RNA sequence: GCUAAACCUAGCCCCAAACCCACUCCACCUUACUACCAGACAACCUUAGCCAAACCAUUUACCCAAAUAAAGUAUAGGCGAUA
RNA sequence: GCUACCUAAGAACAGCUAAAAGAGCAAGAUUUAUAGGUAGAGGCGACAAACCUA
RNA sequence: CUCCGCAUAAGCCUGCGUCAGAUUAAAAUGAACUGACAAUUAACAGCCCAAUAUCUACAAUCAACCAACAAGUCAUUAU
RNA sequence: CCUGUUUACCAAAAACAUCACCUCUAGCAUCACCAGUAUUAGAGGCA
RNA sequence: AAUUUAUUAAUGCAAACAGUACCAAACCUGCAUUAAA
RNA sequence: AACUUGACCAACGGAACAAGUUACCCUAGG
């Protein structure tokens, strides 16, 4: 027999049932979105169309991203979108030559980064691309806030975004407790990224983390039926007294 | 060659296996040094048997009995028969107030009770 | 059950410690070194190689008395039970170490070369130039790792600018700081090499099984 | 950053569709490695006297390694942001005034 | 000085804590609510547990110095 | 004359349509189906070879969202097979 | 759970020459029970290129 | 006739006890097959132990004498 | 050039192992070698 | 035997890194070069 | 650039490019 829905749609159907459906609409959208990450390991085509040299005809051209493998270690650090490239190469760049397995790994470094919003120093593993990206963003706090989830490619980076975003949303006085004037200055510089605290809480959470967070919120002790029946009897008595 | 299908029991296996596995009897104590067994009186179930002298109910019921409709008890029915009368009287007298639910037998928590309904801590 | 090293004791003691043979296998259970297997059961005696180790409260040079010198199954050299203060420990025995002898362990470098006494432990810098030494350490306080086998002895060729040059039993120069303690004299069992195994069976007693390359 | 390209062409997938990639489409050739490129200077606005450019508020093109390791963490310099440029510009104007 | 007790036999060092703990103002979502371990949630930090009563068969004695009869001067018995 | 022979149901197949499952009590990750003691092990990483080339050495297939048509066309390819 | 090797902790071995203990006739490079380890691009092998439940 | 036997361990799991049978062994009493009924009772054995520190150089061999080498199954105290 | 396993067995033979012998590599510790340190350890040959 | 060096070690270059004119730690990643299996 | 040129591809209708050995042998039919 056949299934009612294609097997590839079963995942989306899960989000329409049970605890996943009750998750915030804004959070669910983040999961549904499939934005294309910035090209890192390949050179994108400049235009939609190109002139074929062999036959001199205008033909459509499409950008096909290279599959990038992200090891678990990368999630702790910030690799700026870089990852392992698992593919194959031709020996001596000759098609006739044997096909050889090849892996291209990035160059990782240990660096210290200071977050103005979080007022903390972090030791994280980064590539040269991450350092360049931070420079173009004029600071870590800008790089973390500006970069989308698909570009960051880091669980730690998305965790930092929730940290920074929540402080901006909550207007936390914990930042620079002794200097309120300094605290206001930092908050003013990042006012653009400030989003409501409600939405900021679900930023960067995984589906498992979101489900657990929603389970705790929903989790409540059952109400004794003694309290429920008492409210009903009292209401019935009051209405009976009113009619009398 | 070993029999997979048969039920695994303490009769099977070597001396170590046969000693460790039991037949489902509940433990009534612990083992001390020298494999001495200490029996805890409280762990031993105490049978609470009533006095049946002068008791009119017998194992069977006479066939000359009016058949009645089956009405399983519910939480609402118990409330209407055990808790509603007291609240109804107090409401007319105005003494009733929500803060005093315990007066009618409400238990805010089960902690500190000998027989706790949830989690059940007493045997049938 | 997977391989667990027997070398788990954390507190020093002179009581022989039960050992577990490896059979030439590493933690993976696969043979790494061939020809190792079986043999007589052996107990390990924790040998103290930091000769100059004063007691917890006490400090500075101290003396020890050689209670006993006995055979050791875990090494070619003989060992000596030495008692100083309220502490006993196992050390490597010199060629002429004997029961009842008193030995000195000092970490003081004299203005000149102190008289060389067999079984004593002074800093290399203090030891006279051209003296047979054993149980030498590469770094101050590291503990003796060299010239520990039976009958082996290195010579202190020269002391230059706070360092000492010693000849290892393989006739190779070694340079260490002058504050590195060492033991004067040859190691015990100088006649170890002379002994003939004689019988193939004896090799099995020593825990060495047949090893066929091809 | 290693940049690669495919040996074999990938047929067009069409609008709103993703290419079907066969085993041959995993073969790559190394187009370029970003590390093997002449380094570029990092533009910074100094906030303190430095042996090279004591002049506070002066745009400098220091080496990326030097600026990242020392000037930026220690607070000697700040990024040449459009906002930062305006702030220091006023001081250069006010000082003349 | 040779130390006794090889590393392989010593208790394995604690795993590296989740980085969400480093971030100020963030509460790491852990599996403590589930009452069991899951690999996709952060490990909870549990407060030291005390039985709260006396159980002879599971008794733990206080630190040696806290003992009432502890003395600074040693006695040789 | 024996041995036997004979039977028509049990169900099953292919579609269509609809997105399925499961807490009496008790037991069950330890030697599963074992009432009752200080845990800590934690998951993520190109499918491969090969149908064929009458050998084999690059080379062919198994998924990504509309039947049909454009079209076995453009195009790729020891420019061979084939795709 | 066969077999090869190994680990842990066990067990067995009459008499006869009998110094020497040794497959001498009839206590060892012996035999053996239990549990564990090494796995096929491998393991193990006093190496037959053998054995690793045909 | 004895080649064993009895017991324990391991393994096995009701597999020659009673009753009945039209089933079964060469054998229409036997029965190890079928149906029903019964049975092996703990003292043997298994199943053990509060914490922290600390203690544990001297083989076994009738263990004494004479000996060795392959260097050895056997132990605490304090609170 | 000692004895030990192996197919065979009265067995012989060869093979392998191995005492001795020989060359080869290695100056060191917290999972094998080894809780060892060149009189050591490993890898070979040995008529 | 041709094919290959993906693999492992070795070296070089670049990469990363610092200091008093001129030079610097191995690891790590990328690209070469002989070897090994 | 073009016009053109080039393999003793001699196993010469030419695979772009590859040897020994198996008396331990494995598979195939005759
Ligand atoms: K049985
Ligand atoms: Mg008993």
Curated annotation (Swiss-Prot), chain A:
It comes from Homo sapiens (Human). Belongs to the bacterial ribosomal protein bL28 family. It holds the Pfam family Ribosomal_L28. GO terms for cellular component: cytosol; mitochondrial inner membrane; mitochondrial large ribosomal subunit; mitochondrial ribosome; mitochondrion. Potentially represents an important therapeutic reagent for HLA-A24 patients. This antigen is recognized by tumor-infiltrating lymphocyte (TIL) 1290 in the context of HLA-A24. SUPFAM superfamilies: L28p-like. InterPro entries: Ribosomal_bL28, Ribosomal_bL28/bL31-like_sf, Ribosomal_bL28_sf. The keyword Ribonucleoprotein applies. One of its GO terms (molecular function) is structural constituent of ribosome. GO terms for biological process: mitochondrial translation; translation. Transmembrane segments: none annotated. Found in a variety of normal tissues including spleen, testes, thymus, liver, kidney, brain, adrenal, lung and retinal tissue. The gene is MRPL28. Residues 1-54 form a transit peptide. Keywords: Mitochondrion, Ribonucleoprotein, Ribosomal protein, Transit peptide. This is Large ribosomal subunit protein bL28m. PANTHER family: 39S RIBOSOMAL PROTEIN L28, MITOCHONDRIAL (PTHR13528), LARGE RIBOSOMAL SUBUNIT PROTEIN BL28M (PTHR13528:SF2). It is found in: Mitochondrion.
UniProtKB/Swiss-Prot annotation, chain B:
Keywords: Apoptosis, Cell cycle, Mitochondrion, Ribonucleoprotein, Ribosomal protein, Transit peptide. Present in kidney, liver, thymus and testis, and at lower level in brain and spleen (at protein level). The keyword Lipoprotein does not apply. GO terms for molecular function: RNA binding; structural constituent of ribosome. Disulfide bonds: none annotated. InterPro entries: Ribosomal_mL41 (IPR019189). It is found in: Mitochondrion. GO terms for cellular component: mitochondrial inner membrane; mitochondrial large ribosomal subunit; mitochondrion; ribonucleoprotein complex. One of its GO terms (biological process) is mitochondrial translation. Component of the mitochondrial ribosome large subunit. Also involved in apoptosis and cell cycle. Enhances p53/TP53 stability, thereby contributing to p53/TP53-induced apoptosis in response to growth-inhibitory condition. Enhances p53/TP53 translocation to the mitochondria. Has the ability to arrest the cell cycle at the G1 phase, possibly by stabilizing the CDKN1A and CDKN1B (p27Kip1) proteins. Belongs to the mitochondrion-specific ribosomal protein mL41 family. This is Large ribosomal subunit protein mL41. The gene is MRPL41.
Curated annotation (Swiss-Prot), chain C:
It is found in: Mitochondrion. Keywords: Mitochondrion, Ribonucleoprotein, Ribosomal protein, Transit peptide. Signal peptide: none annotated. GO terms for biological process: mitochondrial translation. GO terms for cellular component: mitochondrial inner membrane; mitochondrial large ribosomal subunit; mitochondrion; nucleoplasm. The keyword Cell division does not apply. One of its GO terms (molecular function) is structural constituent of ribosome. The keyword Mitochondrion applies. Component of the mitochondrial large ribosomal subunit (mt-LSU). Mature mammalian 55S mitochondrial ribosomes consist of a small (28S) and a large (39S) subunit. The 28S small subunit contains a 12S ribosomal RNA (12S mt-rRNA) and 30 different proteins. The 39S large subunit contains a 16S rRNA (16S mt-rRNA), a copy of mitochondrial valine transfer RNA (mt-tRNA(Val)), which plays an integral structural role, and 52 different proteins. Belongs to the universal ribosomal protein uL2 family. This is Large ribosomal subunit protein uL2m. The gene is MRPL2. The chain holds residues 61 to 274 of 305 of the full protein.
Curated annotation (Swiss-Prot), chain D:
Belongs to the bacterial ribosomal protein bL9 family. It is found in: Mitochondrion. Component of the mitochondrial large ribosomal subunit (mt-LSU). Mature mammalian 55S mitochondrial ribosomes consist of a small (28S) and a large (39S) subunit. The 28S small subunit contains a 12S ribosomal RNA (12S mt-rRNA) and 30 different proteins. The 39S large subunit contains a 16S rRNA (16S mt-rRNA), a copy of mitochondrial valine transfer RNA (mt-tRNA(Val)), which plays an integral structural role, and 52 different proteins. The lineage of its organism: Eukaryota, Metazoa, Chordata, Craniata, Vertebrata. Keywords: Mitochondrion, Ribonucleoprotein, Ribosomal protein, Transit peptide. One of its GO terms (cellular component) is mitochondrial ribosome. Transmembrane segments: none annotated. GO terms for biological process: mitochondrial translation; translation. Its main location: mitochondrion. The chain holds residues 53 to 149 of 267 of the full protein. It comes from the Eukaryota. GO terms for molecular function: RNA binding; structural constituent of ribosome. This is Large ribosomal subunit protein bL9m.
């Amino acid at each position: 027999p056949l299934h009612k829905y294609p097997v590839w749609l079963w995942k989306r159907l899960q989000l329409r049932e049970g605890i996943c459906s009750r998750l915030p609409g804004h959070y669910l959208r983040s999961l549904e979105e499939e934005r294309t990450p910035t090209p890192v390991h390949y050179r994108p085509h400049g235009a939609k169309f190109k002139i074929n040299p062999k036959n001199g005809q205008r033909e459509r051209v499409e950008d096909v991203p290279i599959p990038i493998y992200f090891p678990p270690e990368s999630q702790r650090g910030l690799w700026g979108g870089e990852g392992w490239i698992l593919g194959q190469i031709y020996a001596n760049n000759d098609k006739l030559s044997k096909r050889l397995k090849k892996v291209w790994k990035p160059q990782l470094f240990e660096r210290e980064f200071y977050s103005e919003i979080l007022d903390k120093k972090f030791t994280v593993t980064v590539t040269m691309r991450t350092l360049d990206l931070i420079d173009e963003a004029y600071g870590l706090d800008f790089y973390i806030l500006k970069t989308p989830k698909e570009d960051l490619c880091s669980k730690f980076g998305m965790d930092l975004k929730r940290g920074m975003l929540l402080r901006l949303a909550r207007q936390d006085p914990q930042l620079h407790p002794e200097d309120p004037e300094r605290r206001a200055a930092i908050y003013d510089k990042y006012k653009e990224f400030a989003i409501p605290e409600e939405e900021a809480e679900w930023v960067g959470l995984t589906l498992e983390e979101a489900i657990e967070k929603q389970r705790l919120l929903e989790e409540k002790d059952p109400v004794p039926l003694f309290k429920i029946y008492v409210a009903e009897l009292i209401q019935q008595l009051q209405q009976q007294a009113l009619s009398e | 060659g070993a029999d997979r299908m048969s039920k695994w029991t303490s009769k099977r296996g070597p001396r170590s296996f046969r000693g460790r596995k039991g037949r489902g009897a509940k433990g009534i104590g612990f083992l001390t040094s020298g494999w001495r067994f200490v029996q805890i009186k409280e762990m031993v179930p105490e049978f609470v048997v009533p006095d049946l002298t002068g008791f009119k109910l017998k194992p069977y019921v006479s066939y000359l009995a009016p058949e009645s409709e089956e009405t399983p008890l519910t939480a609402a029915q118990l409330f209407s028969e055990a808790v509603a009368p007291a609240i109804e009287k107090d409401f007319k007298d105005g003494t009733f107030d929500p803060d005093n639910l315990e007066k009618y037998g409400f238990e805010p928590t089960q902690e500190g009770k000998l027989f706790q309904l949830y989690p059940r801590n007493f045997l049938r | 059950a997977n391989f667990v090293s027997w070398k788990s004791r954390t507190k020093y003691t002179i009581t022989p410690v039960k050992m577990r043979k490896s059979g030439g296998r590493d933690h993976t259970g696969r043979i790494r070194v061939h020809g190792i297997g079986g043999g007589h059961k052996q107990r390990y005696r924790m040998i103290d190689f930091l000769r100059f180790r004063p007691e917890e409260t006490k400090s500075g040079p101290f003396e020890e008395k050689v209670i006993q010198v006995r055979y050791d199954p875990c090494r070619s050299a003989d060992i000596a039970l030495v008692a100083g203060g309220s502490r006993k420990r196992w050390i490597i025995a010199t060629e002429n170490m004997q029961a009842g002898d008193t030995i000195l362990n000092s970490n003081h470098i004299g203005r000149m070369a102190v008289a060389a006494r067999e079984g004593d432990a002074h800093p290399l810098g203090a030891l006279p130039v051209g003296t047979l030494i054993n149980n030498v350490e590469s770094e101050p306080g590291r503990g003796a790792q060299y010239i520990r086998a039976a009958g082996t002895c290195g010579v202190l060729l020269r002391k230059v600018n706070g360092t000492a040059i010693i000849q290892l039993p393989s006739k190779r120069q070694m340079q260490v700081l002058e504050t590195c303690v060492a033991t004067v004299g040859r190691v015990s069992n100088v006649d170890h090499n002379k002994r003939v195994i004689g019988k193939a069976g004896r090799n099995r007693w020593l825990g060495k099984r047949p090893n066929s390359g091809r | 950053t290693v940049i690669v390209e495919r040996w074999w062409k990938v047929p067009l997938a069409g609008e709103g569709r993703k290419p079907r990639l066969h085993r041959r489409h995993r073969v790559y050739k190394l187009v370029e490695d970003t590390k093997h490129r002449p380094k570029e200077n990092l533009e910074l606005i100094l906030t303190q006297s430095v042996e090279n450019v004591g002049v506070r508020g002066d745009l400098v093109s220091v080496k990326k390694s030097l600026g990242r390791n020392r000037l930026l963490p220690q607070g000697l310099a700040v990024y040449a942001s459009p906002e930062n440029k305006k702030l220091f510009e006023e001081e250069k104007l006010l000082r003349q005034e | 000085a040779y130390e006794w007790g090889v590393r392989s036999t010593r208790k394995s060092e604690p795993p590296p804590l989740d980085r969400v703990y480093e971030i100020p103002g963030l509460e790491p979502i852990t599996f403590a609510g589930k009452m069991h371990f899951v690999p996709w949630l952060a490990r909870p930090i549990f407060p030291p547990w005390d039985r709260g009563y006396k159980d002879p068969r599971f008794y733990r004695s206080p630190p040696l110095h806290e003992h009432p009869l502890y003395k600074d001067q040693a006695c040789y018995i």
